């Protein structure tokens, strides 16, 4: 039910950043090494400058390399705060900002698109799909990179009392217990709507010998009556609500100091009150929890930003 539906569980293939299987193990090792190197290269293409005082830093997540039999798709999430023209006018409809120029060389540029260069490096068709995230706290990887690289002036002399307050009012404190119970009631309703549909379609009779072998209940419409794309999909989708988040700091910001910010819930009650079962990613990380760490260098040296989000 939970693992038998694409909308209620995360495919284990997504637990790995390189999604591949080659019979030729050497080619698999090579593809894995190429994915790390390209990931590093892309991180170096995210910082752009229009003028000396206009440097736009795009925050990019780690890449998801989907290796199929015929092509390689490089999917990554990115966050960009448009600070150059954040107006209510339509002036942005008459020029390409630096972030649009960068995204259009991935696939659109007819002469030097990055996909064609990579297609020779990998010897297979390559596509790049950038996906824009509008908030920095929707992806643990983007959130850690932002703090580490952009919020340094807020925690380099201790965590500002305003900085911490902002990191505690990001999300309204949703009641996990009622959201968990609302989800379980919807599942029961959908499950009881299909059983009633079949019970009625059987009691109404929709070869007696054939009435002991076949299990075909009847027309597809009747079996799935009142179960459409407008009411089933969005109600069963999992990991839809952020219910907890912990941001840690460490390093030298003459001795290293660690500060921990903890806000919200780091568990899921959908698994306790229901037969739905939790799954561990890479066999050690709970599915609901997404943890990432990003480090940077200051005058004193290396400091790490460890962020953990609990989406239920």
């Amino acid at each position: 039910g939970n693992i038998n539906n694409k909308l209620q569980h995360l495919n284990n293939m997504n637990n790995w950043n390189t999604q591949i299987y080659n019979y030729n193990k050497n080619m698999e090792i090579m593809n894995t090494m190429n994915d790390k190197l390209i990931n590093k290269l892309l991180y170096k293409m995210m910082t752009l400058k229009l003028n000396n005082m206009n440097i736009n830093k795009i925050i990019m997540s780690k890449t998801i390399n989907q290796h199929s039999l015929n092509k390689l798709n490089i999917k990554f999430y990115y966050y960009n705060n448009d600070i150059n023209n954040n107006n209510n006018n339509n002036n942005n409809n008459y020029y390409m900002n630096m972030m649009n120029k960068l995204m259009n060389i991935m696939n659109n540029n007819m002469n030097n698109n990055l996909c064609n260069i990579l297609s020779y490096y990998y010897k297979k068709k390559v596509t790049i799909e950038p996906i824009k995230l509008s908030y920095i706290y929707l992806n643990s990887d983007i959130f850690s990179k932002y703090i580490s690289l952009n919020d340094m002036d807020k925690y380099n002399n201790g965590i500002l009392t305003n900085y911490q307050r902002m990191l505690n009012n990001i999300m309204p404190k949703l009641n996990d217990h009622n959201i968990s119970m609302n989800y379980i009631n919807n599942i029961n309703n959908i499950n009881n709507n299909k059983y009633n549909n079949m019970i009625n379609l059987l009691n109404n009779n929709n070869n007696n010998y054939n009435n002991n072998n076949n299990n075909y209940i009847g027309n597809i419409n009747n079996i799935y009556n009142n179960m459409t794309i407008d009411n089933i999909p969005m109600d069963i989708l999992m990991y839809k609500y952020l219910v907890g988040w912990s941001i840690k700091f460490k390093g030298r910001l003459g001795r290293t100091s660690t500060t921990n910010l903890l806000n919200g819930t780091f568990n899921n009650k959908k698994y306790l009150w229901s037969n739905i079962n939790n799954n561990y990613k890479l066999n050690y990380i709970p599915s609901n929890h997404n943890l990432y760490n990003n480090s940077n260098i200051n005058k004193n040296g290396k400091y790490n930003i460890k962020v953990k989000l609990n989406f239920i």
């Binding site: 293939m13 790995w16 299987y21």
Partner: protein
């Protein structure tokens, strides 16, 4: 009258249909491998649907024994070789067999399922072609060449002189 749902749409909601094997001439073995079962099984189901419409009797997906690879590491970077972490990788395998089909139709199957392949799934195909004993027109190593060149060079010919 309600909206009619034709058989093609209805088929999608049920297990894939299979064509009967008439003669039993095994023409191809498609083995699929992945490090996870979910995409592997989903893709295997899609192959059976493609074959049915192409007129290819198909059997499977037969699950083959899962291979397990194991690596044991020491958790610490420098010393403390007494605490060791375990890691593993599972190769999931499936076998789909094709019977009593012409080579051209079999190539169409492989081409289509290649065009619409899933992430992290590999595919090996063994084709079996029954032929006649005698055919028409049928169906030097680098080291050896260099040896001949070396044995003709003066540094070697100067000795072979008899």
């Amino acid at each position: 009258s309600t909206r009619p749902y034709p058989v093609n749409v209805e088929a999608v909601y049920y297990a894939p249909l299979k064509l009967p094997i008439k003669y039993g001439d095994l023409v191809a073995d498609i083995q699929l491998r992945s490090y996870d079962n979910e995409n592997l099984d989903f893709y295997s189901d899609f192959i059976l649907r493609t074959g049915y419409y192409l007129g290819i009797p198909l059997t499977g997906p037969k699950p083959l024994p899962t291979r397990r690879e194991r690596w044991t590491v020491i958790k610490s970077p420098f010393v403390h070789a007494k605490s060791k972490e375990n890691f593993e990788r599972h190769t999931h395998k499936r076998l789909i067999r094709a019977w009593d089909t012409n080579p051209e139709v079999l190539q169409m199957l492989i081409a289509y399922i290649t065009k619409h392949s899933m992430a992290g799934v590999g595919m090996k195909c063994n084709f079996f072609q029954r032929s006649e004993i005698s055919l028409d027109l049928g169906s030097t190593s680098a080291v050896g060449q260099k040896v001949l060149e070396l044995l003709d060079s003066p540094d070697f010919k100067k000795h072979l002189e008899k």
